[PDB]
Amino acid sequence: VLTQPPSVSAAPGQKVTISCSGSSSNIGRSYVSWYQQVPGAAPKLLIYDTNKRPSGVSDRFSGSKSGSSASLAITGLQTGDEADYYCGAWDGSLNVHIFGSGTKLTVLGQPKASPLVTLFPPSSEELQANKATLVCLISDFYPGVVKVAWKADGNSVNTGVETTTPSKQSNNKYAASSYLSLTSDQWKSHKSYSCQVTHEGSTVEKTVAP
Amino acid sequence: XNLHFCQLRCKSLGLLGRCAXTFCACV
Amino acid sequence: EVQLVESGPGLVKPLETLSLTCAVPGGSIRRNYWSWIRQPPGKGLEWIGHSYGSGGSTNYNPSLESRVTLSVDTSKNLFSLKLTSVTAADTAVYYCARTVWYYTSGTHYFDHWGQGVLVTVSSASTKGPSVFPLAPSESTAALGCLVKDYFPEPVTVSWNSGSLTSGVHTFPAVLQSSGLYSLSSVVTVPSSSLGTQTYVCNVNHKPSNTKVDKRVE
Amino acid sequence: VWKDADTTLFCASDAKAHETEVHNVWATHACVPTDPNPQEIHLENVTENFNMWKNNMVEQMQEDVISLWDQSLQPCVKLTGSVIKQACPKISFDPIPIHYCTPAGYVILKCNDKNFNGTGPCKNVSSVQCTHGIKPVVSTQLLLNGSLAEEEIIIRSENLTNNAKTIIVHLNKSVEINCTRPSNDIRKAYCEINGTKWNKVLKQVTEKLKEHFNNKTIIFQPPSGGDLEITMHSFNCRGEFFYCNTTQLFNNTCIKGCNGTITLPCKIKQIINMWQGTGQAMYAPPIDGKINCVSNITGILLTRDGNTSNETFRPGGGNIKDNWRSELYKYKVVQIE
Ligand SMILES: *[C@@H]1O[C@H](CO)[C@@H](O)[C@H](O)[C@H]1NC(C)=O
Ligand SMILES: *[C@@H]1O[C@H](CO)[C@@H](O)[C@H](O)[C@H]1NC(C)=O
Ligand SMILES: *[C@@H]1O[C@H](CO)[C@@H](O)[C@H](O)[C@H]1NC(C)=O
Ligand SMILES: *[C@@H]1O[C@H](CO)[C@@H](O)[C@H](O)[C@H]1NC(C)=O
Ligand SMILES: *[C@@H]1O[C@H](CO)[C@@H](O)[C@H](O)[C@H]1NC(C)=O
Ligand SMILES: *[C@@H]1O[C@H](CO)[C@@H](O)[C@H](O)[C@H]1NC(C)=O
Ligand SMILES: *[C@@H]1O[C@H](CO)[C@@H](O)[C@H](O)[C@H]1NC(C)=O
Ligand SMILES: *[C@@H]1O[C@H](CO)[C@@H](O)[C@H](O)[C@H]1NC(C)=O
Ligand SMILES: *[C@@H]1O[C@H](CO)[C@@H](O)[C@H](O)[C@H]1NC(C)=O
Fold first, then answer.
1. Which residues of D lie inside 8 Å of A (Cβ-Cβ)?
2. Ligand minimally distant from the alpha carbon of residue D225
3. Which of C160, C156, C168 is nearest to C217 (CA)?
4. Which residues does chain C have within 8 Å of residue A158's beta carbon, measured at their own beta carbons?
C-alpha cells in the first residue's frame, strides 16, 4: 500500500500538494493515476499517466512524479474540491494495483479546533457479564481526520479494536469514537491502558485503571 | 453485390459483371 | 458517458460465497479490460483483479488469488465476481470499473466507475442491545450511553428523566467482527451541571423491540 | 515463441469525451485513451511471413467502421428491410485515428522491411501493443489521409498475374486534393488538384508498374463501367457524399503542356448506394456553407485488364477492406501463451 498524508487543508483560492510516496517497483515503474471521491459517492478518475485530465476536469488539478514519489497539485481551491484523494500506480513486485493510503482535502470553513478526548472505563454493569468495552470519545475538531491508537501497559493493541469515521456535529465541528472490547479478566489483568488521538500531526493521550 | 443484376447490367455493354464489394463493376 | 451498474446480495452470511454482478449496457464489454475494486466503509481502496472482455486472461490480487473468480458473460453484457468462504473482513463497498492496461508502460488506471454496492457479512439474526452508561470527562465534562451488540439497523436516544435534547451527538454504528453493531450516544456538558442534574438515555430498537431508561451517575 | 492467432483488439483513442463528432461519440464509448509511451521491441534474427490480404485485424477494423457508421448515419429513406423513414439529424463528421491493440498474452508483430509489399516474409521485425493511428475514411479509387511508403512506391497485391485481385498503389509524396462546394445550385462541387504535382507522381507510378510488367506500355483509362460510386470517386466529407469525375486525373497525354491545376466535375447525390451491404439509401439535401476537405492522397486502388505489348489500369474500388489493408499491411496478431 502506497503512502500519503491523511489530511490536507487550506482556504479557498489556494494551492495545495498531495504526496504519494512509493518505490522502485511501482512509481519507479508505472504511470500514476489519482482518484477524487466526494462524500459519499463512488470515485472518479482525476489524473492518469502521471498527469492527464479526462475532459471536463480543470488544469487547476495537476499531476507529477519524481523517482519513486508522485504529487497532485491543486490551485484555485473551491468548496467543490473538498473530497478524498487516492494515487494509483501499478506494481510488478506483487503484480497489483497499489492504491495510495488516502488523503482528505478540507476547504475552510472555520478555525482549526484540536480534538477533545475522553476515555470511559467499562461499566460496573458490563463487567457483571464477564466483559469490557473501553469507549474512547474524540469530539470537537476540524479538519475531520483522526488517527487513533490504544495502548495497554505501553503495548500495541490491534485486537478487538473498532473506530467510527468522523461525523459532523450540530456545530459543524467533527466527532470520532473508538471502542476496545476485552474479557473480564483481560481488563483486571492490565495496569494502565490509554486511548491516543492524533489530529493535524499531534497526539493527545488519556489513561484508565481497573 | 447482387451479382446477376450486375452480370446482366454490364452485358448491355458487352462486358461481364463483377462484384467489387457491394458494388457492381464491369469487365 | 460510459455506464456501469453493480449488483449483489447486500447481506451475506460468513463462510458463504459472495456473488456480485456488474452489467455493462452498450456492448464494449468484449473490447476492454474490467476490474473489481472494494472499499471497506471508512477505509482504503483495494483492487481485487481484472478480466479481459474476451480473454479470458485474468490477473488477481495475490492475497485474494485463492478465493476470487472473475467471469464475463458476454452475451448478457455482464462481468461478475465470486468470492469464496467470505469473512467479517470482506464486508465492504464493491464497484466494477473499466480498465486501461498497456502492459509495458505502466498505465493501470480506472477511467469509468460504477455507482457501488454495499455488502454486509453477518451470520447474526435480529437482536436487541446491551445498554451501558458512561461517566464524568474534561475541564467541562462529557458522558453518555453505549448501545452494544445489536442487529440490524437502526436505534434512538435522549436523557434525564429524558430531560436533555441539544448538545448531543449520536455516533454511527461500528459493526463488530462478531457480526453485531454497537454505538455510543454522547453529550458534552458543563461541569457544574453534574451532581443532581442526572441523565437518562432513550435507546429504542424497532425491529427487535427493546427500550431503555438508562440513568447516569 | 508465438503462433499466428487472433483475439479481440481494443482501441486506443484520443477522442475527447466532449465532442458531438460521431467518431468521438463512438470512440469514447468503445475505446480507451491512447498509450502515453508506445514501446517497440525489435526482434533480431527472426523472420516472419505476413499477408495483408489474410490478416485478421482488417475484418475487426471493418466491423467497427460499419458499427460506427450504422449508429451515426441513419437514412431518411433506407431502401433495405420496407418503408423506413427514420430520423436523419445533421451531426459532426471528421475521421479520427484509431489504434488497435492486443492484450497481454498477445502481441502485434510489426514488419520493418522498408520496401515490403505486404505479403511474404519480413526479416526486419518488431513487437508492439498498438498500431499507428488510422482514420476510417470511406473512399473508392483514391486512398485519402493514409500513410506514405518509406522509400519507394510499393505496389501491393495478392497476385500480380491475376487481373481479378485489386492492386493497391502506395505513394511516397502526398498530393493535396481541395474538394470544395460553394454555398449560395446545391448538387455541384469541385475538387481542385495541382496538375504539376499529380502527373510528376502518376509518372513515378508508371515507372513502378513497368518494373512489374516487363517494361510494357502502362495505360490508364476511366473505369470500364459500373456503379456510380466506383466509377466516380465516392467518399465522405463533413457528412456529405461527394461524387467526383476522376477522368481528367488519370491522363496519359501528360506522363507537353500539362502544368495547369486540374478540377473535377463533382455533384453530391442523395439517392446513393451502400458499402456496408446491398441496397440503396437517401439523405437530406446537403448542408449550407463552403463545404471542403483538404484531403491528402496517399494511395490509388487499381484494376488491370486481359496481353500483347501494353497493359491497361483502370481505377479500382469497392472492397472497402482493401482501404484498411493498405494501412494494416505491416501488422499481424500473434499469441505468446
Ligand atoms: C529495421 O527497421 C527498424 C525501424 O525502422 C530499425 O530500427 C532498424 O535499424 C532496422 N534494422 C535492420 C537490420 O535493417
Ligand atoms: C518515390 O518512389 C518512386 C519509385 O521508387 C521514385 O520514382 C521517386 O523518386 C520517389 N520519390 C522520392 C521523393 O523519393
Ligand atoms: C512480395 O515479395 C515476395 C518476394 O519477397 C513475393 O512473394 C511476391 O511476389 C511479392 N508480392 C507482390 C504483390 O509483389
Ligand atoms: C495467380 O493466378 C493466376 C490466374 O488465376 C494463376 O495463373 C497463377 O498461378 C497465380 N500466380 C501467382 C504468382 O500466384
Ligand atoms: C482550397 O480551396 C479554397 C476555396 O476554393 C481556396 O481558398 C484555398 O486556397 C484552397 N487551398 C489551397 C491550399 O490551395
Ligand atoms: C504544384 O506544385 C508545385 C511543386 O510541388 C508548386 O511549385 C506549384 O505551386 C504547383 N503548380 C501549379 C501549376 O499548381
Ligand atoms: C466523367 O467524365 C467523363 C469526361 O467528361 C465522361 O465522359 C464520363 O461519362 C464521366 N464518367 C462518369 C462515370 O460519370
Ligand atoms: C486529359 O488531359 C489533357 C491534359 O491535361 C487534357 O487536355 C485533355 O482534355 C484530357 N482528355 C480527356 C479526354 O479527358
Ligand atoms: C482528411 O484529413 C483532412 C485533414 O486532416 C481533413 O480536412 C479531411 O476532412 C479528411 N478527408 C476526408 C475525406 O475525410
1. 16-18, 33, 36-37
2. 7
3. C160
4. none
Integer Cα distance of D72 and D88 in angstroms: 9
Contact D36 A52 (CB under 8 A): yes
Question: Atom 2 (ligand 1): residue with closest C-alpha?
Answer: D112
d(CA A156, CA A193): 10
Closest listed residue to residue A134, CA positions, set A115, A114, A150: A150
Resolution in angstroms, to 1 decimal, for this deposition? 3.2
Would you state the cell numbers that stand for residue A121, as one nine-digit string? 472505563
> Diameter of chain D by CA atoms?
63
Q: Of D91, D101, D79, which Cα lies nearest the Cα of D31? A: D101
Residue holding cell 518494373?
A: D211
| Nearby residues of D69 by Cβ (< 8 Å), 6 or more positions away | D138, D276
Q: Determine the structural domain holding residue A172 and report its residue range.
A: 111-210
Put simply, whether C156 touches A (Cβ < 8 Å) is no
What residue ranges do the domains of chain D occupy? 1-337
Residues C100, C107 contacting (CB under 8 angstroms): yes
The CATH number given to whatever domain includes residue A135 is: 2.60.40.10
Work out how many CB contacts closer than 8 A connect A with D.
15
- Residue C193 DSSP code: G
> Cα separation of D100 and D104, whole Å?
14
**Collapsed DSSP state (helix, strand, coil) of residue A158:** coil
Of the bound ligands, which one is closest to the alpha carbon of residue D323?
9
Experimental method: X-ray
Q: Rounded distance, CA D177 to CA B6, Å?
A: 31
Cβ neighbours of residue C65 closer than 8 Å, sequence gap 6 or more = none
**Which positions in chain B touch D277 (Cβ < 8 Å)?**
22
List of residues 6+ apart from B14 with CB closer than 8 A: none
Q: Is the CB of D237 under 6 A from ligand 2?
A: no
Q: How far is CA D96 from CA D27, D145, D163, D326, D331, in A?
A: 9, 11, 34, 17, 20
Gap between the Cα atoms of D108 and D129, Å rounded: 6
CA distances (Å), origin C199, targets C158, C196, D31 = 9, 9, 63
What one-character-per-residue DSSP string does A68-136 give?
TEEEEEE-S--GGG-SEEEEEEEETTTTEEEEB--EEEEE--S--BPPEEEEEPPPTTTGGGT--EEEE
Q: Which of C1, C106, C111 sits opposite D29 (nearest CB)?
A: C1
Amino acid (1-letter code) at residue D313: F
Eight-state DSSP code of residue A80? G
Residue with cell 497489483: A96
Q: Which domains does chain C have, with CATH numbers?
A: 1-123 (2.60.40.10), 124-217 (2.60.40.10)
CATH of domain D1-337: 2.170.40.20
Contact D275 B22 (CB under 8 A): yes
Residue of chain D with shortest Cα separation from A51: D36
* Length, in residues, of chain D: 337
Overall number of domains in chain A: 2
**Of D224, D227, D247, best ligand 7 pocket probe by most atoms within 8 Å of the beta carbon:** D247
CB-CB: which of B13, B22, B26 is closest to D277? Answer: B22
Beta bridge partners of C96: C36
Closest in D8, D17, D36 to C53, CB measured:
D8
Which of residues A110, A143, A170 is at a domain's end? A110
In angstroms, rounded to a whole number, what is the distance separating the alpha carbons of residues C158 and C144?
Answer: 10
Beta pairing, strands C11-12 & C142-150: unpaired
Peptide bond between residue D299 and the one before it cis (omega within 30 degrees of 0): no
Last residue of a domain, one of A64, A94, A110: A110
Q: Is chain C adjacent to chain B, meaning 3+ CB pairs within 8 angstroms?
A: no
Instruction: Report whether the peptide linkage leading into residue C152 is cis, meaning its omega lies within 30 degrees of zero.
Output: yes
Give strand pairing partners of C73: C78
**Residue identifier of the C-alpha nearest atom 1 of ligand 3:** D117
Chains A and B make contact, 3+ CB pairs within 8 Å? no
